[PDB]
Amino acid sequence: EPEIASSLIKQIFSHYVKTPVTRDAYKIVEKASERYFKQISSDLEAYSQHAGRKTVEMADVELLMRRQGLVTDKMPLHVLVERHLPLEYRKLLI
């Protein structure tokens, strides 16, 4: 039942791609997004249980983005935050 709104997925995807995308293609993006969340739920669980915690902390998510190869020595998490999160939300993280 719960999922990211279609419109928002479309906004982000298209904002980035700068190329025409069919309707049905978007349906594919939506299903991919569902799967994305299933997987990271699994992952964050494994990460937190690994550290002996029942709760998901920040360190777990940063670890995830490291394993995803988004956060690297040359691209720190705080840089990604500053770049991709609207002004208001980034203040919460810094």
């Binding site: 494994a46 990460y47 550290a51």
Partner: protein, 100 residues
């Protein structure tokens, strides 16, 4: 400082990994009825050497995440999660260790 010795260590490890790659490749050649060129074997050896770097850095990250400076079977299990086949295989292996 220790740089020359480190270069010797690197050549030692490259050559060791290359030998083992040759032996394993030979088993595969036998299974499949193929011949691997020297260059192919060397290529797989270098690829394997390189991948070791990411394995090591990820293992170390995984141990640190546990407030732990020594790497264990739990970190290797985590390292293998992204491939379900691999995870099943390595988890089997690990249990086998557990029994002693």
């Amino acid at each position: 400082a220790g740089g020359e010795q480190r270069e010797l260590l690197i050549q030692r490890l490259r050559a060791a990994v290359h030998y083992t790659t040759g032996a394993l490749a030979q088993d595969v050649a036998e299974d499949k009825g193929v011949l691997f060129s020297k260059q192919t074997v060397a290529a797989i050896s270098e690829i394997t050497f390189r991948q070791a770097e990411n394995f090591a850095r990820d293992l170390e990250m995984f141990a640190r995440h546990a407030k732990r400076s020594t790497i264990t079977s739990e970190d290797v299990k985590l390292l293998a999660r992204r491939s379900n086949s691999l995870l099943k295989y390595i988890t089997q292996k690990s249990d086998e260790l557990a029994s002693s």
